[PDB]
Amino acid sequence: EVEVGINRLGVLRADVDNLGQAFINGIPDDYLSISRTATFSRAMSRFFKNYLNQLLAEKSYKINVIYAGGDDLFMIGAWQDILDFSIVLKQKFADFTQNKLSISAGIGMFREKYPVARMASLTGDLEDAAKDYKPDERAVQATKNAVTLFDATNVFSWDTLENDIFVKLDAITKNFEKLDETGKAFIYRLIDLLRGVNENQQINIARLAYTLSRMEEKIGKTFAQELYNWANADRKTLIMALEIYILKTRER
RNA sequence: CUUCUUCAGGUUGGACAGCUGGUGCUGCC
Ligand SMILES: Nc1ncnc2c1ncn2[C@@H]1O[C@H](COP(=O)(O)O[C@H]2[C@@H](O)[C@H](n3cnc4c(N)ncnc43)O[C@@H]2COP(=O)(O)OP(=O)(O)OP(=O)(O)O)[C@@H](O)[C@H]1O
Numbered sequence: 566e567v568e569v570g571i572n573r574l575g576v577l578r579a580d581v582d583n584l585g586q587a588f589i590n591g592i593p594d595d596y597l598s599i600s601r602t603a604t605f606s607r608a609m610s611r612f613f614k615n616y617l618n619q620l621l622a623e624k625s626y627k628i629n630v631i632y633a634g635g636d637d638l639f640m641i642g643a644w645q646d647i648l649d650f651s652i653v654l655k656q657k658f659a660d661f662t663q664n665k666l667s668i669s670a671g672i673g674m675f676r677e678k679y680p681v682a683r684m685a686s687l688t689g690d691l692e693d694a695a696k697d698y699k700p701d702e703r704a705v706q707a708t709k710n711a712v713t714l715f716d717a718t719n720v721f722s723w724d725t726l727e728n729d730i731f732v733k734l735d736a737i738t739k740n741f742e743k744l745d746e747t748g749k750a751f752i753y754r755l756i757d758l759l760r761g762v763n764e765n766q767q768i769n770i771a772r773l774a775y776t777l778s779r780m781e782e783k784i785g786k787t788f789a790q791e792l793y794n795w796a797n798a799d800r801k802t803l804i805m806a807l808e809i810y811i812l813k814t815r816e817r
Numbered sequence: 818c819u820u821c822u823u824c825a826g827g828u829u830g831g832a833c834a835g836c837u838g839g840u841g842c843u844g845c846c
């Protein structure tokens with residue numbers, strides 16, 4: 566049903582972080598009652614089932630939800646629908662839970678005949694890679710508040726990190742729709758030369774020099790140097806946002 | 818039976834310098 570995009574099947578596995586701990590010791594001991602525990606349980610279950618149904622039915626979503634139940638989530642649908650509903654899910658969970666419970670997800674791209682058992686297993690281990698996220702290896706236990714985006718090693722977050730990646734994605738989508746339609750061939754050049762930076766650095770600074778060299782009447786070099794500015798501090802962020810932009814805008 | 822057989826300066830200087838278009842589609846689980 567998509568016109569510009571990719572022919573991949575995206576899935577979502579959202580698991581609330583430390584819900585079992587939120588039941589063991591999350592609720593205050595002084596405010597401990599059977600009615601209050603039942604209220605919290607029913608609120609969470611109603612949230613998941615009912616509000617997932619209503620949130621998808623609010624407007625046209627290409628999602629074919631497999632399971633909501635409780636504390637878990639499975640979804641299969643259009644790849645871009647999975648990506649743009651992950652943010653909706655995180656913001657709705659934050660609003661309903663008042664930013665008290667963390668959630669983790671995992672998204673995988675699959676063909677039209679990929680093994681669905683393999684789909685689920687890969688999405689589960691990506692979910693675990695999102696569950697075991699720690700900015701620093703000093704504090705006990707994991708933050709658990711992360712999302713893996715198509716790879717177990719690509720553990721991004723939902724915080725200001727995801728804010729940055731989505732701001733970058735929106736900016737790139739707005740800017741790079743209308744190039745000269747001929748100089749855009751440098752995009753794959755950048756992608757394949759930034760795939761990993763632990764090796765010959767000569768070509769990276771060479772591409773920087775080439776971008777500086779490119780001089781005509783265009784948007785200018787404001788964003789053409791913002792690419793360089795974002796090409797050093799944010800390496801994995803730039804490659805992830807750029808790959809998301811490419812997959813969204815690929816003429817496939 | 819004379820008296821120089823060429824000497825001294827400019828050796829390239831500017832202008833453009835790669836643009837446009839396509840850009841993995843079909844067949845199978
Ligand atoms: N009222 C109540 N219900 C359930 N467990 C309760 C309660 N009071 C105390 N406890 C204790 O908590 C743990 C729960 O462990 P578990 O039995 O594995 O059960 C599942 C699941 O049945 C239950 N669950 C899921 N959804 C709900 C809702 N909506 N309401 C109540 N209970 C619910 O919680 C467990 C889910 O396990 P995980 O998803 O793996 O936990 P996690 O948050 O994802 O951890 P992490 O991977 O992020 O680190 C028992 O000890 C029980 O006695």
Ligand SMILES: [Mg+2]
Nearest residue numbers: 580581584636
């Ligand atoms: Mg859970």
Ligand SMILES: [Mg+2]
Nearest residue numbers: 580635636637
């Ligand atoms: Mg669970």
